[PDB]
Amino acid sequence: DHIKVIYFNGRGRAESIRMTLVAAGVNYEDERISFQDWPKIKPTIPGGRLPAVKITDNHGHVKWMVESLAIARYMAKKHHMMGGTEEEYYNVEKLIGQAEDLEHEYYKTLMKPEEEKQKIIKEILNGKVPVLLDIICESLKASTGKLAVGDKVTLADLVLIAVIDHVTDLDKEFLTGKYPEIHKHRENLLASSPRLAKYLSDRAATPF
Amino acid sequence: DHIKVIYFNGRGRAESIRMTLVAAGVNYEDERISFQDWPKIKPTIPGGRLPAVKITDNHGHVKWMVESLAIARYMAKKHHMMGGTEEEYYNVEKLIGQAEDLEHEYYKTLMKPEEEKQKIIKEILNGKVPVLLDIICESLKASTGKLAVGDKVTLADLVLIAVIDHVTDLDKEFLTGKYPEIHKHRENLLASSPRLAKYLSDRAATPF
Numbered sequence A, B: 001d002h003i004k005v006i007y008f009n010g011r012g013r014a015e016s017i018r019m020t021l022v023a024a025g026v027n028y029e030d031e032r033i034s035f036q037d038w039p040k041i042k043p044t045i046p047g048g049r050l051p052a053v054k055i056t057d058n059h060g061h062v063k064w065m066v067e068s069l070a071i072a073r074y075m076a077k078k079h080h081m082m083g084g085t086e087e088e089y090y091n092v093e094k095l096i097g098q099a100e101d102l103e104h105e106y107y108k109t110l111m112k113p114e115e116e117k118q119k120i121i122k123e124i125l126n127g128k129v130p131v132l133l134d135i136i137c138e139s140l141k142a143s144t145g146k147l148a149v150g151d152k153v154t155l156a157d158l159v160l161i162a163v164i165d166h167v168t169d170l171d172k173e174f175l176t177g178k179y180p181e182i183h184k185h186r187e188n189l190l191a192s193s194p195r196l197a198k199y200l201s202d203r204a205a206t207p208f
């Protein structure tokens, strides 16, 4: 099967899909669309939004997938990364929901003409961001393993590390000297996943 | 088992949990905390945030759950409401992610001193809301059954109808004469679920 991930030049919503595939060891073609070329590409995409995933068979079948975390979860479910039990399933999802809350705090800073961007960053770094980082810390503390849930990689590991990269985009020292469970989590994750470690070292710094 | 759902006086984040339980036919105690009483209740809640679910055994065990859609999904997974296949699982999640996008549009209108509330409602009803309602329409159209995914209730049915109630909170006629797949979906859902129909008729109108 040929797997094509279609997104813009960045981490953004596609990141959970790429990391899932990378961690799973699944090869894919990583297609980035420029903002200039997007007007002509948009009509060729079912739903006209990105990220979109196009999966092609060696027998001519073509499957289109949209909705990033639905794709990530389906892929994660395929490669045993959503929990081995109901309880682990719950905990994966708990950490994902918490990580997404924080992502939505990060979203508030986008499409902002600066100045009010800065005024928002302050609002959130002084408000909900620390609250959420702490809740995430507690979610990690309650694990029986080195990682988010047990000792094996799950989608929760991947979604977490992408969201932290967004926090550090707003304030690079925000986690320095604090939240030891999150630093340690990243450390354990990269140790557990040489593929994800190499992938992370080959990005390709992007503004989002 | 005794199941206690703890939230504020409203639909909000707890709604997906209540509906899941109701649809599943699972009895629970529905605890609403007043804003006046919240300061004293907050420290007794693991993580200090709501919704929280407290499950008690007939053998003294006490299980605390937080993170609404993680709880809803776990419960939905228990009662066969997350898909019977990987493909159905994907489609449940696709519709949930789309419904949550729209919920986040709705969130933008909250905590707003009016006036700017109205200015936002206009922004979103003229921008992303119609885009999302249409995408949801396409997700429903691609189902092989009367409901979101097949003919049986899944968490996607429940999350959708709660999000539409929030859209109609902003503008009650926004879907009048439009989006036939969404009206029909609600119609099929209530037909398929007498329990959810009765539950919906016994709310208890709330501001959120």
Ligand SMILES: N[C@H](CCC(=O)N[C@@H](CS)C(=O)NCC(=O)O)C(=O)O
Pocket (backbone or CB within 6 Å): A012, A013, A042, A048, A049, A050, A051, A066, A067, A068, A069, B097, B098, B101
């Ligand atoms: N629920 C999101 C929605 C994706 C989304 O907001 N797409 C944006 C880019 S990040 C987009 O396609 N906007 C450009 C357009 O609508 O034409 C997902 O994770 O898939």
Ligand SMILES: N[C@H](CCC(=O)N[C@@H](CS)C(=O)NCC(=O)O)C(=O)O
Pocket (backbone or CB within 6 Å): A097, A098, A101, B012, B013, B042, B048, B049, B050, B051, B066, B067, B068, B069
């Ligand atoms: N990810 C959300 C977070 C819940 C949340 O934002 N809780 C709010 C009420 S809707 C809250 O507990 N705020 C009051 C407080 O933090 O003390 C969930 O679905 O559980």
